[PDB]
Amino acid sequence: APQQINDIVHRTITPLIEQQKIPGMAVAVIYQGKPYYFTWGYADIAKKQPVTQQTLFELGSVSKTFTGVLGGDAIARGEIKLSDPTTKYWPELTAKQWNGITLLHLATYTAGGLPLLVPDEVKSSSDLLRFYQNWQPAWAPGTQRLEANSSIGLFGALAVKPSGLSFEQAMQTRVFQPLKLNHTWINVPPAEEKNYAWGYREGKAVHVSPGALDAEAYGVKSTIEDMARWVQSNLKPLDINEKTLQQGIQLAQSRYWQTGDMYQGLGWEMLDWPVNPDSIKIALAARPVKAITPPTPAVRASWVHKTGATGGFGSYVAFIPEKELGIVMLANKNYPNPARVDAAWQILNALQ
Numbered sequence: 001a002p003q004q005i006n007d008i009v010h011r012t013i014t015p016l017i018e019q020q021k022i023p024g025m026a027v028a029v030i031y032q033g034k035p036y037y038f039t040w041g042y043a044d045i046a047k048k049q050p051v052t053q054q055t056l057f058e059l060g061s062v063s064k065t066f067t068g069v070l071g072g073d074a075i076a077r078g079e080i081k082l083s084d085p086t087t088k089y090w091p092e093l094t095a096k097q098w099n100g101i102t103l104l105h106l107a108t109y110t111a112g113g114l115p116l117l118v119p120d121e122v123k124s125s126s127d128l129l130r131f132y133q134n135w136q137p138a139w140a141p142g143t144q145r146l147e148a149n150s151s152i153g154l155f156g157a158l159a160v161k162p163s164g165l166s167f168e169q170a171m172q173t174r175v176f177q178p179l180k181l182n183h184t185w186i187n188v189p190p191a192e193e194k195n196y197a198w199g200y201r202e203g204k205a206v207h208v209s210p211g212a213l214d215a216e217a218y219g220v221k222s223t224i225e226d227m228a229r230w231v232q233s234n235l236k237p238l239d240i241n242e243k244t245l246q247q248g249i250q251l252a253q254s255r256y257w258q259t260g261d262m263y264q265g266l267g268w269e270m271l272d273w274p275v276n277p278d279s280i281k282i283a284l285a286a287r288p289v290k291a292i293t294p295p296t297p298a299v300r301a302s303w304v305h306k307t308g309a310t311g312g313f314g315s316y317v318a319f320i321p322e323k324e325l326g327i328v329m330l331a332n333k334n335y336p337n338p339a340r341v342d343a344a345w346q347i348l349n350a351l352q
């Protein structure tokens, strides 16, 4: 590819792999709408399979960008509304604390302290009902943001309900297919197992385990190729043929709440571009939010991104719609979010 692109990429990621002792990594850079690929290390140390443009990485929380979009698509389809109480799609949600809790609240982590992880002992639909029924809000809805799987995850599950499709049923046919992401899955087919990389946590090959609402919050696995297309799709949403998926993408990039200089979308998070590097280990930051009334439409001059991880994988997606620029980073080792963002900024800012 262009030697300029080739050079920041290699000069930033190389030491990054060395300092963080990252087994395998994949990187895509979207320059003026064209993807450039890079690959290092191993997808499976034991079998010496290297990382390739075909390797599957666990996206972790980056999965929330898909849930965000799929939900925006359901809104566009008129199957759900963000202004609707959560009880509309789950009538058995009788506890009185759900009253003024809307789908917008679930989707944006502002319901009032929904826990970061759904408890491991919640292993059944009925288990899931009781958990949400018995949850006690630490705060009033629309006052604080506490990032959580159990918040966005229930939103994903409720958003596809009117449709009658499973979440994965809706994801495939309403988002992966339309977008030609043929190597992106919530569940990896046996046919793709030879591309599924192992994650590395403390020296052992690990894969994410099943959990409640896992497909909706941290479940998708994908290649740098499909991720590149995913970034391409979120950069230029007007070039998408299926009309609700177009609207859906834009809605996910809308600004619903503001905290510091960070804005909260559906899955995606945004910062006004140009952005200061200072701005971009605290397992839990509760942050009050200012409501953006009404929500601002997706802003070209943003730095839209999202981190995500699992026991064995660390990933990051960042793109500036206005510069038609973007990057994707996928490693099979969970390493410091900050190093991810530094590397992202260094590459991208060096290309305008």
Ligand SMILES: *C(=O)[C@@H](NC(=O)c1c(-c2ccccc2Cl)noc1C)[C@@H]1N[C@@H](C(=O)O)C(C)(C)S1
Pocket: 060, 061, 062, 116, 117, 147, 149, 208, 218, 283, 307, 308, 309, 310, 311, 334, 337
């Ligand atoms: C998304 O990636 C979320 N994490 C998980 O669901 C998850 C983790 C994990 C990894 C590092 C630190 C904490 C946790 Cl819980 N391990 O397995 C799973 C399924 C949340 N998003 C993360 C992010 O923004 O990168 C966190 C750390 C805020 S937790």
